[PDB]
Amino acid sequence: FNKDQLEEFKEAFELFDRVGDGKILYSQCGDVMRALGQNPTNAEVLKVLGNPKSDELKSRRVDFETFLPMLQAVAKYEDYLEGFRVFDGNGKVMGAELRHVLTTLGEKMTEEEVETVLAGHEDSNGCINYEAFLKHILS
Amino acid sequence: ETTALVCDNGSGLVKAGFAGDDAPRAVFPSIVGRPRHQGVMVGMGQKDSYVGDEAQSKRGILTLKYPIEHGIITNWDDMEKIWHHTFYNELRVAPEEHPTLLTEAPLNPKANREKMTQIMFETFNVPAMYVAIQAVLSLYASGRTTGIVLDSGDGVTHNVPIYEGYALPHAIMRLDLAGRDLTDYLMKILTERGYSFVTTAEREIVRDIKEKLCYVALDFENEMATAASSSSLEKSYELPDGQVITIGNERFRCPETLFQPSFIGMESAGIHETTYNSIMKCDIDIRKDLYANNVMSGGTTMYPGIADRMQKEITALAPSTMKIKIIAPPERKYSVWIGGSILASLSTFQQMWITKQEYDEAGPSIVHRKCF
Amino acid sequence: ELYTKYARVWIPDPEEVWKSAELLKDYKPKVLQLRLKDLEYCLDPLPPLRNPDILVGENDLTALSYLHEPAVLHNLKVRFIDSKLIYTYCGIVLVAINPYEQLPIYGEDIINAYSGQNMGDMDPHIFAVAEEAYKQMARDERNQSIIVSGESGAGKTVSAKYAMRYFATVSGSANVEEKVLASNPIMESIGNAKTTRNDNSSRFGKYIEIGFDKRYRIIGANMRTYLLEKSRVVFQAEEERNYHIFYQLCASAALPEFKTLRLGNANYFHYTKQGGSPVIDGIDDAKEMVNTRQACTLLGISDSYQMGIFRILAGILHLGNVEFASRDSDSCAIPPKHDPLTIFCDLMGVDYEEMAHWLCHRKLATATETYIKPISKLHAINARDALAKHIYANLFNWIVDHVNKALHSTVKQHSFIGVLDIYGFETFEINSFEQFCINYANEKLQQQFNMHVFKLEQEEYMKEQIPWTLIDFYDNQPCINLIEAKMGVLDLLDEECKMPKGSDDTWAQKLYNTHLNKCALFEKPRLSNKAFIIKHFADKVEYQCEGFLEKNKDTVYEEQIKVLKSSKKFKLLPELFQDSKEHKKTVGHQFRNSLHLLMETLNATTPHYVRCIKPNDFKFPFTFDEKRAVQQLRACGVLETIRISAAGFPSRWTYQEFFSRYRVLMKQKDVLSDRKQTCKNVLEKLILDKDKYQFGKTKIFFRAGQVAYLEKIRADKLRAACIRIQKTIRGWLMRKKYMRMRR
Amino acid sequence: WXAXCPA
Numbered sequence A: 001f002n003k004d005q006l007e008e009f010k011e012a013f014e015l016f017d018r019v020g021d022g023k024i025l026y027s028q029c030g031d032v033m034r035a036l037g038q039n040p041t042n043a044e045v046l047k048v049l050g051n052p053k054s055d056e057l058k059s060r061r062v063d064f065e066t067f068l069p070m071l072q073a074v075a076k077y078e079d080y081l082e083g084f085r086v087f088d089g090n091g092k093v094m095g096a097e098l099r100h101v102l103t104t105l106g107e108k109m110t111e112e113e114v115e116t117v118l119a120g121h122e123d124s125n126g127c128i129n130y131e132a133f134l135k136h137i138l139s
Numbered sequence B: 001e002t003t004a005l006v007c008d009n010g011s012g013l014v015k016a017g018f019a020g021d022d023a024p025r026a027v028f029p030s031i032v033g034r035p036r037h038q039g040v041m042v043g044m045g046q047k048d049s050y051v052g053d054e055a056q057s058k059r060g061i062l063t064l065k066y067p068i069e070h071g072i073i074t075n076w077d078d079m080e081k082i083w084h085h086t087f088y089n090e091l092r093v094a095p096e097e098h099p100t101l102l103t104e105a106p107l108n109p110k111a112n113r114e115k116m117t118q119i120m121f122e123t124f125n126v127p128a129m130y131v132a133i134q135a136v137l138s139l140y141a142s143g144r145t146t147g148i149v150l151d152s153g154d155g156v157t158h159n160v161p162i163y164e165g166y167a168l169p170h171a172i173m174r175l176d177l178a179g180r181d182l183t184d185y186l187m188k189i190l191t192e193r194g195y196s197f198v199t200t201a202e203r204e205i206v207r208d209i210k211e212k213l214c215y216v217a218l219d220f221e222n223e224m225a226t227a228a229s230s231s232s233l234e235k236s237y238e239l240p241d242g243q244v245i246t247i248g249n250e251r252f253r254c255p256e257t258l259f260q261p262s263f264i265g266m267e268s269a270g271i272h273e274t275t276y277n278s279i280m281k282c283d284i285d286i287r288k289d290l291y292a293n294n295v296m297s298g299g300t301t302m303y304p305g306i307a308d309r310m311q312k313e314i315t316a317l318a319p320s321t322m323k324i325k326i327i328a329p330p331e332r333k334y335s336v337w338i339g340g341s342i343l344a345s346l347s348t349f350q351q352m353w354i355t356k357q358e359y360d361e362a363g364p365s366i367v368h369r370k371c372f
Numbered sequence C: 001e002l003y004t005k006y007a008r009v010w011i012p013d014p015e016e017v018w019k020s021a022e023l024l025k026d027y028k029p030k031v032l033q034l035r036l037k038d039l040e041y042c043l044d045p046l047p048p049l050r051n052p053d054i055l056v057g058e059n060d061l062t063a064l065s066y067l068h069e070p071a072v073l074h075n076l077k078v079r080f081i082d083s084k085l086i087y088t089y090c091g092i093v094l095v096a097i098n099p100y101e102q103l104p105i106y107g108e109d110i111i112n113a114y115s116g117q118n119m120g121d122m123d124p125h126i127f128a129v130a131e132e133a134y135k136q137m138a139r140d141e142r143n144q145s146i147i148v149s150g151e152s153g154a155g156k157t158v159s160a161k162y163a164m165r166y167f168a169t170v171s172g173s174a175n176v177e178e179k180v181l182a183s184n185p186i187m188e189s190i191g192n193a194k195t196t197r198n199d200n201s202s203r204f205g206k207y208i209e210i211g212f213d214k215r216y217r218i219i220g221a222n223m224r225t226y227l228l229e230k231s232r233v234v235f236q237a238e239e240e241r242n243y244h245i246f247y248q249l250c251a252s253a254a255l256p257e258f259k260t261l262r263l264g265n266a267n268y269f270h271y272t273k274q275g276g277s278p279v280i281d282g283i284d285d286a287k288e289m290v291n292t293r294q295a296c297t298l299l300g301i302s303d304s305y306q307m308g309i310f311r312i313l314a315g316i317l318h319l320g321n322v323e324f325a326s327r328d329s330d331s332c333a334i335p336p337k338h339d340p341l342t343i344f345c346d347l348m349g350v351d352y353e354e355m356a357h358w359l360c361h362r363k364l365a366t367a368t369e370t371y372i373k374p375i376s377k378l379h380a381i382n383a384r385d386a387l388a389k390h391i392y393a394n395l396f397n398w399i400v401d402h403v404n405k406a407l408h409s410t411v412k413q414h415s416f417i418g419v420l421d422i423y424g425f426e427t428f429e430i431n432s433f434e435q436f437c438i439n440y441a442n443e444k445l446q447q448q449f450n451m452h453v454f455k456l457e458q459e460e461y462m463k464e465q466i467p468w469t470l471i472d473f474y475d476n477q478p479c480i481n482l483i484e485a486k487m488g489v490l491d492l493l494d495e496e497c498k499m500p501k502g503s504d505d506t507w508a509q510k511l512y513n514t515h516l517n518k519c520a521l522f523e524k525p526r527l528s529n530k531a532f533i534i535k536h537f538a539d540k541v542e543y544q545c546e547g548f549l550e551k552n553k554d555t556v557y558e559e560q561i562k563v564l565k566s567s568k569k570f571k572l573l574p575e576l577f578q579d580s581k582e583h584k585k586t587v588g589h590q591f592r593n594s595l596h597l598l599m600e601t602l603n604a605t606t607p608h609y610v611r612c613i614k615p616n617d618f619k620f621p622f623t624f625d626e627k628r629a630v631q632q633l634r635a636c637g638v639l640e641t642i643r644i645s646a647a648g649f650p651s652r653w654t655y656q657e658f659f660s661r662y663r664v665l666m667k668q669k670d671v672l673s674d675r676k677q678t679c680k681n682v683l684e685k686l687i688l689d690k691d692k693y694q695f696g697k698t699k700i701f702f703r704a705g706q707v708a709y710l711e712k713i714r715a716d717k718l719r720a721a722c723i724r725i726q727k728t729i730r731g732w733l734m735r736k737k738y739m740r741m742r743r
Numbered sequence D: 001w002x003a004x005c006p007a
């Protein structure tokens, strides 16, 4: 990352600081990386955070300088399509099955997150064109 | 399954039947008759031989041989007829399909066993054969495993002490005084009353007297003095033709010869004193058991009172403390057959048979080696 | 070889036969670190391994991917407790566990619902097997029979009740079955007994032939009985009873009809006295017989014959009280007047003096003459007991005829379906000649079972292309040869009955001398001469020799039968005998021959099987106890069947159902509409070789564990994709948060 | 027999 990127990222980081000390919590680091274009797994997020314990994850605050190596470490379509084609061959996916798997398998989400991401993508039968949904969520 | 045959070559009877039966399916005199007179009527029937009940029915016309004398088979040519008649006529059975069990007196000439086997395998082709000591079979017959068996046939008397199912062969005694010698003596003494019985057919007329009217004196000298003192003993009998003959003390005088063979002119002692001198040969440990288990066997021990006369006599030889008991089941004439029927149906025995195969390999010497 | 952290395994335990663990150290090659909630548990010169939760509860115990006693016991436990399902299948064998409460399940609309449908199509129920029997009999004129087997009280008779009710409702169009059910009180009263473990154990084997016309309407039913435990009549182990009817009769002595039978209390008579236990808890036999007498009255036996039957049983009880004085080693006698012979001769109307003579002496008659002997007091006692056993067994065989006269119908029986209720393999903490017979009949029945299952698999493989040689089976013939063949245990038992003096002490010495180190399956208990140990198919059993011979021996003196047959007082007593070499046959050879009469009846037939197992000893409703149930399931041969199946290719998938479940493994590259060839391509990628699978015509066969392998790789791919999708959703959603804040 | 007796 160059100076311009570091400046934009630091400014964005400071916008998410809700306490005024110029810091975010460890638990927000992953969120900031994802907002900045990274796609780390929860395991990867904890790894770049150093697998923090609950107490420091919930109350320890870190500035940009300690965050930066973690962003770097994270930084250093066809699979997405095959992954969706697993659950398909008319180019659709049931809303119920995606909802169930997203709320019960993997990194389980809340019903509101799944409804939000699925909102406007299903038809009257409740089917989502997944190539369009994938392009949408990758944009 | 195929059942074994059980056959007993007595001197006086053949007894045969199927193993598992409680009585023989055939009994008949082991007697072979040939016609002696001229055959007058052309077109009547003709036979070179009669056997058993046939030779009985016609006996007036016949000379009657016994092929067995003192338990030795004295000519084989007739004996083979007696067996042939037994299997084919009396039992009506093919011997090719059934094991056969054959019965013998303890000391008799060892050549007898060889020939008796050789005829079973060569003539009848029997699958399997065995030969068993008469006194042994009497124990199976009388539900016992220890005893001294006194067994007396038409042709032989013998003792065989057995303890815990071990036989004890040094202690085994054989007097050949038997039914036939009681008959011949009965004829000689009957001559005193002015009757003579001269021929084979007539000798069996004597024998029927012996069977019907003989009995054993509980004291010999008492009854001998009694009959001289009064005739209450005296009884009388009808010959086949209807002549009556009348007999007194003389009807006991034959059974007494078993207790004094000096009458017949034998050396050896009565069968009480052989029985005792057999027990004395036994180990002093066992004898208390042999004194209790005295077993009568064979038809010559059917005479009324022989049991008590034995007990009263041997209870005089034996030491006063010992319990002496005499065991005389009323079927004892059969008992050697019965005990052979029991023995032949045991499963342990089935390994014991002399096989046709092993005879064919080994030759008739096998019968001494395997059988005992 | 798979074990990881978050693997699960079964481990043995004293209290429940198995307990689960999770493994929380990855194992590679000597000790495992397990949580339960910690132990390290030793490996020894591997632990059993556990099915994924999708399998457990699946409707066929051969469906599981790991097959072993823990998984089977677990499935049956969860199905029984949680889903209240009493019925489960193993292979072809239905397995049934008695709920021991009433249930709705047997109602009419279920009977109707099952009709017409195959054994895969529906969840297991007794009706499903009866419907298989009916459907095979509809394909083939070949008769069918149904075999119901288990420990006493496991529910055999009730399972027969329902299996017949299925035919009665589906086929029947009008009244056989109401008569069949009215037969149950009679056959139980004469045929059931109280035993050490439970009361009301059936001591015989009962076969009902439901007869059909050529349109398979029920015409009529024919009842046969086998293997009757005759020895129980005269002898009883401690705390047992002879057949219930004797106690019902004794309990009824106060009633005015019975008053002429001059009965006592039930511990008066020497036959009932012996067990020491007159009264059963919660059964009043006085109001049992009112039931059984009504059952006779309905099922067509007159009051004349009923009073005949009770007059005969009272005759037997009075017979047993006859006691003999000795005179001699070789002679016994009867005291000048003996009351239980005086009464007995009045009851059956014969000369006291003639029974007094013929009881005491015996007669034997040759070609020429008849001889009459004294006999010892022990032989006279054996003769008296053999007489009582012969009278009883003929009264039984007569009551079964007068039942059949009520149950036959004159129309031609085109074919029949048969139902069999028979005591299960049974092992106790004393074992005795009865148990030896029961275990011999069970060895025979599970030879027929092994040969049948091996035949059905030879048929299935030939519906496919696959070589038979992969199949093999447990042949138990060497144990039957040990028990049954010449120089076998039963043969040397009869030999002691023949041999001049015989005793269990002298018997056992013969057993040892012949078998002891000649045979792999016969063993001596290390510290007794008196007993011997047989390796029966399920488990080693130790039999005590003591009192085999007394149980082994029957011989009825013909003249004793003739004295009874001379009776003119009443019509039943002549009728029983009226209808030798038979009379000699020992109990251990009448049992052999009745087991042949059974097995030749079944071998003419095609079997279907039901196994009953009892959850708990204490009559607790609808609980379950591991420690019994494992013994039951070994006794059923279920475990051996399962182990055999695990040795083979147990799992089946149809190409459609495999493709449908495992499409997630495949790719759009790799799907072509000829499903079979696509799966042939994919599988060789996924699993190395045919050594783990066979391509059938319509099914794929796998060796054990490859299903778990498929589920493992499927679940891994499923989580990998799921987490990828969540991660990307949160990436763009956090870009939405970045928009939310920066806007 | 063969010696001491007639049979």
Ligand SMILES: Nc1ncnc2c1ncn2[C@@H]1O[C@H](COP(=O)(O)OP(=O)(O)O)[C@@H](O)[C@H]1O
Binding pocket: B009, B010, B011, B012, B013, B014, B152, B153, B154, B155, B178, B179, B180, B207, B210, B211, B212, B214, B298, B299, B300, B302, B303, B333
């Ligand atoms: N009831 C009897 N009383 C006296 N003597 C008999 C009686 N029965 C048979 N005998 C005689 O005993 C002999 C037959 O005895 P038995 O045991 O039949 O001979 P075997 O040894 O041939 O079987 C014959 O001499 C016969 O006369």
Ligand SMILES: Nc1ncnc2c1ncn2[C@@H]1O[C@H](COP(=O)(O)OP(=O)(O)O)[C@@H](O)[C@H]1O
Binding pocket: C098, C099, C100, C101, C102, C103, C151, C152, C153, C154, C155, C156, C157, C158, C159, C200, C201, C202
């Ligand atoms: N399916 C079932 N439903 C209800 N009760 C049952 C069932 N199976 C067994 N039982 C109970 O178990 C008892 C003992 O079994 P039963 O069949 O009578 O004896 P056995 O098994 O010796 O023939 C039955 O009387 C009944 O009370």
Ligand SMILES: [Mg+2]
Binding pocket: B010, B134, B152, B153, B154, B298, B299, B336
């Ligand atoms: Mg004799």
Ligand SMILES: [Mg+2]
Binding pocket: C156, C157, C158, C202
């Ligand atoms: Mg029952």
